[PDB]
Ligand binder design. Structure first.
Ligand SMILES: Nc1ccn([C@@H]2O[C@H](COP(=O)(O)O)[C@@H](O)[C@H]2O)c(=O)n1
Length: 377
């Protein structure tokens, strides 16, 4: 019998966690691996060192039918070690479960490892504040059973359904915020139900790698020597962090780009509401999917040092290269940032994201700043 490891994520944070998993397990050159990480391209000089290494496109938050061609190459008993984005877990596993239906005698699910998309899960859970969570859990388990038995998806509570995987498989959840599950009292039945099936995302993992693995990991995440040297300058630093919109609406993307540029000006200009001081070196950490929103900043700002957008902010924490101050639009990156490094967090326009951050003490009780409430400088 054979284990096949699948690394699946259309987003950013779960993929970053999974690249660490790959690094920790990188000595085994023959272990079958299937990478479905949309935002990441494993360098060819790494692929070359591995056999039984496979790549699958994601479409509509699920591996395409090309997954089946890969799995067909392993005609014996196979156990699937699946790494998943939590918010998209139901769709991402969908084709794996379809394949299993057709190959009942040889395909099993060994275990799930699940990682937060990021703030998304917490914003979603916040919207469930007024529900009987204990009862939502039981209904979600029942409906998960219907899914596993019929292949059909129908959840009364899609959000709670994300957390009932243990009723079917050995699972481990990796949470951006374990504090949220403790502090949100309405969620106490969920914390109790999840028992010993969860842990916090471990940001000390990198410090524990061998020098060789640390180098390997940095290559995976794109943290090159040029970027490292730019952050090793001996001057106090501010990193302005970008956001993106999922709206494939051009007018919305253009509005975001404009508001974000104006927000940067509020941090960096002396007359800005959020003025940080003249002594800072200014950096830009665009959102991985900002695209033309990122370009807008670089084309329209000055005296700013770009940090390549696909480099996850959290890599700076691992490498001990965090700046003095960080500011920009509310982001998953702010959940693991030391409090002393927050300049200001700004929201796009009872806001559940605001509520999430307030519950966690990431922001205080003062009036939140939305970016449409900032004067155009
Ligand atoms: N400016 C940004 C925004 C996001 N990100 C990465 O993408 C993830 C999800 O962030 P968002 O919640 O902003 O979509 C983060 O945890 C961070 O790794 C980044 O590296 N730089």
């Amino acid at each position: 019998m054979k284990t096949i490891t699948l690394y699946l994520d259309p987003a950013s944070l779960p993929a970053l966690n999974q690249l660490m998993d790959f690094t920790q397990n990188n000595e085994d050159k023959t272990h079958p691996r299937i990478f479905g990480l949309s935002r990441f391209k494993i360098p060819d000089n790494i692929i070359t060192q591995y056999q039984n290494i496979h790549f699958v496109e994601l479409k509509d938050n699920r591996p395409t039918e090309a997954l089946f061609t890969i799995l067909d190459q392993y005609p014996g008993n196979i156990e699937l070690n699946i790494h998943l984005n939590i918010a998209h877990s139901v769709q991402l596993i969908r084709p794996i479960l379809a394949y299993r239906f057709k190959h009942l005698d040889r395909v099993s699910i060994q275990q799930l490892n699940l990682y937060d998309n990021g703030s998304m899960e917490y914003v979603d859970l916040e919207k469930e504040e007024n529900k009987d969570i204990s009862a939502e859990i039981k209904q979600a388990e029942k409906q998960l059973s219907h899914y596993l038995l019929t292949g059909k998806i129908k959840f009364d509570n899609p959000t709670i359904a994300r957390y009932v995987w243990q009723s079917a498989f050995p699972v481990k959840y990796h949470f951006l915020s374990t504090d949220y599950f403790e502090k949100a009292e309405f969620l106490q039945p969920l914390k109790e139900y999840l028992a010993e099936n969860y842990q916090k995302m471990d940001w000390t993992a990198y410090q524990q790698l061998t020098p060789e693995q640390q180098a390997f990991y940095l290559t995976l995440v794109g943290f090159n020597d040029e970027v490292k040297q730019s952050l090793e300058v001996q001057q106090a630093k501010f990193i302005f962090t970008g956001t993106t919109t999922w709206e494939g609406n051009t007018d919305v993307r253009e509005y975001y780009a404009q508001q974000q540029l104006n927000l940067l000006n509020h941090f960096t200009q002396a007359e800005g509401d959020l003025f940080i001081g003249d002594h800072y070196k200014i950096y830009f950490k665009g959102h991985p999917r900002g695209g033309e929103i990122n370009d807008y900043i670089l084309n329209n700002a000055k005296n700013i040092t770009n940090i390549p957008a696909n480099i996850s902010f959290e890599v700076l924490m691992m490498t001990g290269l965090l700046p003095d101050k960080v500011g920009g639009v509310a982001s998953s990156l702010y959940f693991s940032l030391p409090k002393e490094k927050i300049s200001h967090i700004i929201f796009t326009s009872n806001n559940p994201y605001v509520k999430v951050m307030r519950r966690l003490g990431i922001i205080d009780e003062s009036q939140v700043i939305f970016w449409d409430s900032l004067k155009q400088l």
